[PDB]
Amino acid sequence: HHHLILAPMVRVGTLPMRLLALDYGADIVYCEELIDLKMIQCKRVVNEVLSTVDFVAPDDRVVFRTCEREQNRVVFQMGTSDAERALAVARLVENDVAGIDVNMGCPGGMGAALLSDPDKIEKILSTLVKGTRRPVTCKIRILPSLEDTLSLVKRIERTGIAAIAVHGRKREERPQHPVSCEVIKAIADTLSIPVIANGGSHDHIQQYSDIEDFRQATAASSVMVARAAMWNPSIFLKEGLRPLEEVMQKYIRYAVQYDNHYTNTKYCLCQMLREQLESPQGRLLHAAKSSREICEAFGLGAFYEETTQELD
Numbered sequence: 001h002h003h004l005i006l007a008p009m010v011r012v013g014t015l016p017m018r019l020l021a022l023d024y025g026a027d028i029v030y031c032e033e034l035i036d037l038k039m040i041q042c043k044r045v046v047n048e049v050l051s052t053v054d055f056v057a058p059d060d061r062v063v064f065r066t067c068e069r070e071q072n073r074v075v076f077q078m079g080t081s082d083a084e085r086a087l088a089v090a091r092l093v094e095n096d097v098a099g100i101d102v103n104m105g106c107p108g109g110m111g112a113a114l115l116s117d118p119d120k121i122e123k124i125l126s127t128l129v130k131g132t133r134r135p136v137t138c139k140i141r142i143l144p145s146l147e148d149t150l151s152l153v154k155r156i157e158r159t160g161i162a163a164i165a166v167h168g169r170k171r172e173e174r175p176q177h178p179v180s181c182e183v184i185k186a187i188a189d190t191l192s193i194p195v196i197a198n199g200g201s202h203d204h205i206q207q208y209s210d211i212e213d214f215r216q217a218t219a220a221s222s223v224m225v226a227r228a229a230m231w232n233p234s235i236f237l238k239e240g241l242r243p244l245e246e247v248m249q250k251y252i253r254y255a256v257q258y259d260n261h262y263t264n265t266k267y268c269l270c271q272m273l274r275e276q277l278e279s280p281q282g283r284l285l286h287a288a289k290s291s292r293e294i295c296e297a298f299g300l301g302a303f304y305e306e307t308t309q310e311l312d
């Protein structure tokens with residue numbers, strides 16, 4: 001049995017999508033990238049009302065929210081360009097998450113910008129590996145040189161990281177451009193640690209059975225799914241895809257139970273609906289100025305009132 005992983009995604013990877021991905025059969029769920037500069041301003045707050053652990057910023061904004069359900073399966077992804085600041089964040093969240101990931105693939109010089117400075121990647125990763133009891137991973141995009149990609153990947157493993165997620169595309173290579181299954185394979189063979197294949201959503205993964213095909217084509221230990229999970233989170237379901245109306249109902253119920261900010265809920269729903277945003281329901285969703293108005297657009301107004309009342 002191989003591992004089905006929810007890839008990190010800014011705005012999409014909040015608590016409601018993570019819980020929904022686990023319900024549909026994901027083994028590991030990554031959260032959206034969170035910048036170290038915001039996280040170092042946060043306090044850990046135990047929320048007895050929602051039964052969540054909250055990481056609250058000085059402006060009273062909840063930056064990260066987790067719960068007992070994802071406790072052993074959530075991977076905290078951070079945006080960092082400083083080893084001490086990275087460890088400060090890991091020490092804040094380590095008791096509430098299952099792993100620590102560092103973005104090395106993004107477009108303040110943190111993501112794919114790090115790929116050019118292997119000395120900085122080496123400093124950041126070793127500091128985290130030595131400083132936390134949690135498995136450290138990272139997520140990279142490939143380099144323009146196959147020699148430099150392979151050189152960097154062996155350098156990354158040497159820091160003592162648990163696994164490496166490989167997005168089989170170079171920085172500047174648009175999603176239009178196909179994924180490099182060959183470059184992921186060359187990496188998976190040369191490494192002793194597990195390699196997580198990533199990058200084949202529209203072109204390779206349209207159904208559950210295609211995930212195994214992509215793991216074979218790349219010779220990786222597991223596959224990480226982003227866009228296909230964003231479009232329909234039931235991509236993890238072995239039995240087949242579920243109707244979107246059904247998935248969206250389950251999405252909103254989680255967003256209300258866990259007091260997700262309505263603009264975030266709205267965003268994730270627009271990503272699922274995409275062409276259906278011109279339907280009367282899509283028009284109503286676009287117009288929604290609150291969580292109550294989102295539930296109204298989806299016949300969940302009764303559910304919202306009963307949850308809001310039971311929460312207050």
Ligand SMILES: Cc1cc2nc3c(=O)[nH]c(=O)nc-3n(C[C@H](O)[C@H](O)[C@H](O)COP(=O)(O)O)c2cc1C
Binds near residue numbers: 008009012106199225
């Ligand atoms: C909306 C969106 C947000 C993303 N945010 C992040 C992020 O927070 N961290 C990250 O490492 N990659 C981010 N990615 C990239 C994905 O994790 C992934 O590497 C990429 O989409 C290729 O995988 P896929 O073909 O399965 O979509 C994002 C992708 C999308 C579509």
